[PDB]
Ligand binder design. Structure first.
Ligand SMILES: Cn1cc(-c2ccc(Nc3ccc(C#N)c(NC4CCCCC4)n3)cc2OCC#N)cn1
Ligand SMILES: [Mg+2]
Ligand SMILES: [Mg+2]
Ligand SMILES: [Mg+2]
Length: 272
């Protein structure tokens, strides 16, 4: 068994939630037997670019605490030359693990989750942050409410397993312009997050991502950028939801709907 100290407060580790690179997230208990998640970053072999990404993520997470409750709570942190400890709320489950377990999603829960994500992403955009790598794993379900966990500034972590692993990230939420930018101008804009949000909502509507069927990677990337590749939008009773999806998944970012527009859309506004 293991334990840890953060700004003079002791926590006992229950299990490891996730890990990625020099980072680990643990489910812990304080002295009062209250649950938290602690992200541990080992900085021993970290370069100045990796260091600055962890510093920038902490500064933005702390700054944005007061601006939205759709951003994960950061209670405390410790930073030295050797490590980082971040004390956060634990939550119930990340949105990716939740979507993989769920068979059918209630239209009211899908709508409520959509509103939470728009608000979180809108808040970061207002502070000049574009995530550019949004996936369901970036969102935490905390008592039926979605909260953005990270800002895409530091390295991404994957959930851990207690079994021996056999062989990775996802390409299913990647904007078409993120692919086109690699050969070449900034390219990136708040619209890149709209596309990724659109892929998440598409998953919550049709049970798959827009290009989940394409197993091959080079053929998937081609399909995301190809204008002749028609994305299927099967008819559903929620006509407003069908329009949101079509407007989020436009290949030209200039034609793609914005976050302020999505917040005034009937899907989010009509019937509360
Ligand atoms: C059945 N299941 C539950 C989870 C889960 C997943 C995440 C969290 N809480 C947090 C709280 C903070 C962070 C950070 N930073 C974080 N990161 C994970 C890393 C792996 C990918 C998902 C996000 N996860 C709590 C979670 O469950 C409650 C606990 N412990 C995953 N599968
Ligand atoms: Mg598992
Ligand atoms: Mg397993
Ligand atoms: Mg297992």
């Amino acid at each position: 068994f293991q334990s840890m100290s953060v700004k003079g407060r002791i926590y006992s580790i229950l299990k490891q939630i996730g890990s990625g690179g020099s980072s680990k997230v643990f489910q812990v208990l304080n002295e009062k037997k209250q649950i938290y998640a602690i992200k541990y970053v080992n900085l021993e072999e970290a370069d100045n670019q990796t260091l600055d990404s962890y510093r920038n993520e902490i500064a933005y997470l702390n700054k944005l605490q007061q601006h939205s409750d759709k951003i994960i709570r950061l209670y405390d942190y410790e930073i030295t030359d050797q490590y980082i400890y971040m004390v956060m709320e634990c939550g119930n489950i990340d949105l990716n693990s939740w979507l993989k377990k769920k068979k059918s999603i209630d239209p009211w829960e899908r709508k409520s989750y959509w509103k939470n994500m728009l608000e979180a992403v809108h808040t970061i955009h207002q502070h000049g942050i574009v995530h550019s790598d949004l996936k369901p794993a970036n969102f935490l379900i905390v008592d039926g409410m979605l909260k953005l966990i990270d800002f895409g500034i530091a390295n991404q972590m994957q959930p851990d397993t207690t079994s021996v692993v056999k062989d990775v990230g996802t390409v299913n939420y990647m904007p078409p312009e993120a692919i086109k930018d690699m050969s070449s101008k900034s390219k990136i804009s708040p619209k890149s997050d709209v596309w990724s949000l659109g892929c998440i909502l598409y998953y919550m509507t049709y049970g798959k991502t827009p290009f989940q069927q394409i197993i091959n990677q080079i053929s998937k990337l081609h399909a995301i950028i190809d204008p002749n590749h028609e994305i299927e939008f099967p008819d559903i009773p929620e006509k407003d939801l069908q329009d949101v999806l079509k407007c989020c998944l436009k290949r030209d970012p200039k034609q793609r709907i914005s976050i302020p527009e999505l917040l005034a859309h009937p899907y989010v506004q009509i019937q509360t």
